[PDB]
Design a protein around this nucleic acid. Structure first.
Ligand SMILES: [Mg+2]
Ligand SMILES: [Zn+2]
Ligand SMILES: [Zn+2]
Ligand SMILES: [Zn+2]
Lengths: 57, 67, 56, 48, 263, 147, 45, 61, 49, 113
RNA sequence: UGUAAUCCCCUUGGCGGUU
């Protein structure tokens, strides 16, 4: 709905099969943990990585 | 399907008390008294025997697939 | 285990076996032959053991 | 041509002693064996 | 300085009171008894034939949960620490089960008494499934009708309840201290009066209730702990308590050795 | 936020554990007077464009047997369709591709034990098989529960 | 070469990839394969 | 034993036995269908025989 | 005999309540696959409007 | 699928040390101890034992994440005492307490047997 | 020295899940 629905996080590799979020960011995403799913997109370049870390963080 | 070996919550072995429980209920004892006579104090254990549904008696009625 | 064999008829011929007289003192009888009897199916060992071979 | 590929194998050492599996990958000195007991595939040295 | 006082004693449960110990020590002892005392349990099932209505892994899960006598499990070695190829008699116990129904009518029950110990460590009292009495049939494993057969070979290994709950010797450890709430460690929810709305603790008679004019004592600490240890029959209650203490001692000694060897 | 904490020891003792079955179907199609599909274990020599999975779990009749553990992309049904031969009969010692693979692989994300294999004939008189796979699903982080 | 079991009478037999799919005694049209001879092992967990 | 001998022993057992469990269900179902056909034709004579046969065959446990 | 047989079988199999060549403009979804996830779901599906 | 092996809770890899000690230079005479394959059972015992020593001025521990079996402990003693000696004294004292507890329980059990 | 394999519809329809 708004531009806070896409934000760039830092990866931390963990066991088990679910994405894990700090609960403070569940408000901008309008998400809760009753079955919601979220999408992850990986940048493929140095320029794109810099854009993500400097603009959408 | 068949009486669980261990109570889910604590881990007491309740799998050896199904036949005794049925025998006690046969003699007219109430369910609470039957569970008390088997020394099931915690209600976590009591729900295991009280709410078990025995479905294997229905699966066994089908003719075996081999002989 | 072996009554239904085609050769069992000659195999059982002349054999000596313990027999229940019924009328029980067990005794020995000599097999003069065998004769299949239709409609005389009988339990041999269990309920499913339906046999129609007969021993004379 | 990796004669032990697609052959039943048993593990004799490590944390999976005595588990039956089937060899899937045989690059070298590190064999990928799927386990019959859980639904997973693990690497394992040839000596094991 | 520490003291132990036993209230009730049985083969399967002991009710005792600890005193002059810290709350942390009692809780660590409870945790160790719950999840760090080694026992013996079935860990591999080789199913040679299973024509029963239950799934193979259903029966395997049921078998793993059957308690086995683990009295001499200290002499036994861990499977991963045994240099023997495959499994030897010093790191595994082999049990075998064979059940069959004869006749074309009726239903046969498969009990844990049918588990027969085939091989194991020499002269060690381990591996036999636990039986309440000599005439106790045991845990119901399966049911069979005509022409259904179950033929399996099970291998029992040594482990702890951290890895899987089937190796836990205890069922439930009741733990309790300060029945009269003199330390004010809990605040009692109420509607009208908190004193008459809350049931008395089962050990309330073991401690003197606070006097009406008594002031709060800020210098007091929990000092007496009441705990009941129930076992599944694989280990006796005294054995569970003593082996929990020994396991805690071994853990602390390992830490001490690591510290001393670090320099 | 609607999550919940579950007891691991209760899960170990069988709480909310369940059983999962999936069935696969396949049948021999008839394309003409003598163009039929065949259930068989295809060979790397006589067939072309084989699946990247493994065919070593198939029996002589091209069907897996119950009790065999299977993984993703494994071949549980072996089927081939005839293809008009090429000019490879020039100098190939019978090792020329006459059939094309139409095998059924197990789903990539699934694995389990082959539970029961059914073989019969369809309405048209051709062969017709059904393979049922069984696995156990234990509760874990992310599974959905409800009162 | 490979065993089979009838779906009604549970009679074991075998087929040679050319016989009609049928039970040889009772004529049932549905047959099942027999269990594999390999070793089956489970982790009991 | 040979294959032919096995087939003969099968034919011996099948011609000996009056019964096979699954097939008794099929005969009773066929008899019920024939009985309803006779009922729809208002044949009061055939239906009595079919009822007697069904009574004789039935009474399971 | 193929006319009625194929028409009934097609309409019950696909759910389009009409002739096969008039699939458009026909009422769809009349016939559905029975839900067998659990007993209550089947009972609910059999009493749906 | 992604579930780790259960034995990783207590089985120590060869390359991972059981006990890593690093000084904390922000305050004098302080060390940070990282225990591997341990949990609240050992940590709480050690912490509450050390909290009673007059020469230990700060002791604490935390488990960073429940899905990883390790904990980190912060210890900080007086000027005279090296912290590692205090840790060793705590371990030995708890061992003696457990030993006398076992002896007394055995005596009581034999009496009431 | 006998040397191992790389590929997948489409259109409709229904039923669901997260808002
Ligand atoms: Mg939601
Ligand atoms: Zn319980
Ligand atoms: Zn060994
Ligand atoms: Zn048959």
């Amino acid at each position: 709905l708004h531009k806070m629905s896409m934000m760039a996080h830092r990866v931390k590799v963990m066991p088990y099969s679910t994405f894990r979020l700090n609960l403070s960011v569940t408000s901008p995403y309008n998400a809760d943990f009753d079955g919601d799913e979220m999408n992850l997109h990986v940048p493929q370049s140095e320029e794109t990585r810099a854009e993500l870390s400097q603009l959408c963080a | 399907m068949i009486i669980p070996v261990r109570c889910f919550s604590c881990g007491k072995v309740v799998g050896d008390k199904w036949d005794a429980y049925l025998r006690l209920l046969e003699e007219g004892k109430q369910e609470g008294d039957a569970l008390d006579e088997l020394k099931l104090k915690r209600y976590c254990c009591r729900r295991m025997v009280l709410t078990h549904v025995d479905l294997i008696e229905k699966f066994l009625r089908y003719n075996p697939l081999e002989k | 285990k072996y009554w239904y064999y085609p050769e069992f008829d000659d195999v059982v011929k002349g054999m000596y076996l313990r027999l229940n007289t019924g009328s029980s003192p067990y005794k020995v009888v000599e097999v003069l032959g065998s004769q299949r009897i239709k409609g005389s199916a009988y339990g041999l060992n269990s309920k499913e053991n339906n046999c129609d071979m007969y021993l004379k | 041509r990796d004669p032990t590929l697609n052959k039943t194998v048993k593990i004799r050492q490590g944390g999976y002693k005595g588990k039956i599996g089937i060899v899937k990958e045989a690059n070298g000195d590190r064999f990928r064996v799927e386990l019959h007991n859980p639904n997973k595939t693990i690497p394992i040295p040839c000596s094991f | 300085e520490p003291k132990v006082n036993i209230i009730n004693a049985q083969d399967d449960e002991v009710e005792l009171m600890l005193s002059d110990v810290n709350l942390s020590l009692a809780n660590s002892l409870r945790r160790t008894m719950l999840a760090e005392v080694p026992t013996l349990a079935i860990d591999l099932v080789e199913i040679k034939m299973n024509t029963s209505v239950l799934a193979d892994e259903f029966i395997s899960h049921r078998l793993g949960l059957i308690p086995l006598v683990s009295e001499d499990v200290e002499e036994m070695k861990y499977s991963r620490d045994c240099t023997c190829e495959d499994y030897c008699d010093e790191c595994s116990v082999v049990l075998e089960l064979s059940a069959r129904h004869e006749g074309e009518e009726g239903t046969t029950d498969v009990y844990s008494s049918s588990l027969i110990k085939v091989s194991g460590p020499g002269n060690l009292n381990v591996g036999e499934p636990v039986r309440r009495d000599d005439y106790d049939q045991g845990i119901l494993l399966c049911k069979l009708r005509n022409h259904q057969e179950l033929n399996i070979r099970c291998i029992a290994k040594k482990g702890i309840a951290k890895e899987h709950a089937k190796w836990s010797p205890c069922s439930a450890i009741a733990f309790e201290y300060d029945p009269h709430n003199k330390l004010k460690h809990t605040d009692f929810w109420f509607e009208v009066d908190a004193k008459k709305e809350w049931p008395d603790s089962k050990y309330a008679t073991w401690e003197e209730p606070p006097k009406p004019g008594e002031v709060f004592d800020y210098k007091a600490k929990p000092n007496r702990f009441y705990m009941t240890v129930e076992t599944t029959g694989s280990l006796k209650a005294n054995q569970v308590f003593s082996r929990g203490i020994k396991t805690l001692q071994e853990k602390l000694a390992n830490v001490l050795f690591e510290l001393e060897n670090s320099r | 936020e609607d999550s919940m904490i579950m007891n691991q020891s209760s899960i170990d003792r069988g709480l909310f554990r369940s059983l999962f079955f999936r069935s696969y179907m396949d049948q021999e199609k008839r394309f003409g007077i003598s163009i039929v599909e065949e259930f068989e274990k295809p060979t790397r020599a006589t067939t072309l464009r084989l699946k990247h999975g493994t065919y070593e779990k198939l029996d002589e009749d091209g069907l897996i047997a119950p009790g065999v553990r299977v993984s993703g992309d494994d071949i549980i049904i072996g089927k081939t369709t005839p293809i008009p031969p090429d000019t490879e009969e020039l100098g190939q010692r019978t090792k020329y591709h006459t059939k094309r693979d139409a095998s059924t692989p197990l789903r990539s994300t699934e694995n389990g034990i082959v539970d029961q294999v059914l073989l019969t004939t369809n309405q048209e008189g051709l062969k017709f098989v059904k393979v049922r796979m069984r696995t156990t699903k234990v509760p874990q982080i992310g599974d959905k529960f409800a009162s | 070469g490979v065993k089979y079991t009838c779906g009604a009478c549970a009679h074991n037999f075998s087929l040679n990839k050319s016989d009609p799919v049928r039970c040889k005694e009772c004529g049932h049209r549905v047959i099942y394969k027999a269990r594999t001879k390999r070793m089956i092992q489970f982790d009991a967990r | 034993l040979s294959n032919d001998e096995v087939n003969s022993i099968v034919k011996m057992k099948q011609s000996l036995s009056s019964n096979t469990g699954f097939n008794t269900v099929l005969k009773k179902a066929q008899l019920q269908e024939e009985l309803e056909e006779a009922r729809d034709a208002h044949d009061h004579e055939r239906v009595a025989r079919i009822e007697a046969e069904l009574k004789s065959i039935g009474a399971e446990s | 005999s193929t006319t009625i047989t194929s028409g009934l079988k097609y309409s019950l199999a696909t759910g389009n309540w009409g002739e096969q060549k008039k699939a458009m403009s026909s009422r769809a979804g009349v016939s559905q696959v029975l839900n067998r996830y659990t007993y209550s779901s089947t009972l609910s599906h059999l009493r749906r409007t | 699928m992604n579930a780790p092996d259960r034995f990783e809770l207590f089985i120590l890899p060869d390359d991972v040390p059981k006990l890593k000690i690093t000084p904390d230079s922000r305050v004098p005479n302080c060390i940070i101890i990282k225990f591997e394959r341990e949990d609240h059972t050992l940590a709480n015992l050690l912490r509450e034992e050390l909290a009673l020593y007059p020469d230990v001025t700060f002791v604490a521990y935390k488990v960073e994440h429940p899905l990883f079996a390790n904990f980190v402990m912060r210890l900080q003693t007086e000027e005279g005492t090296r912290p590692k000696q205090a840790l060793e004294r705590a371990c030995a004292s708890i061992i003696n307490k457990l030993k006398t507890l076992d002896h007394k329980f055995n005596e009581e059990w034999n009496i009431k047997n």
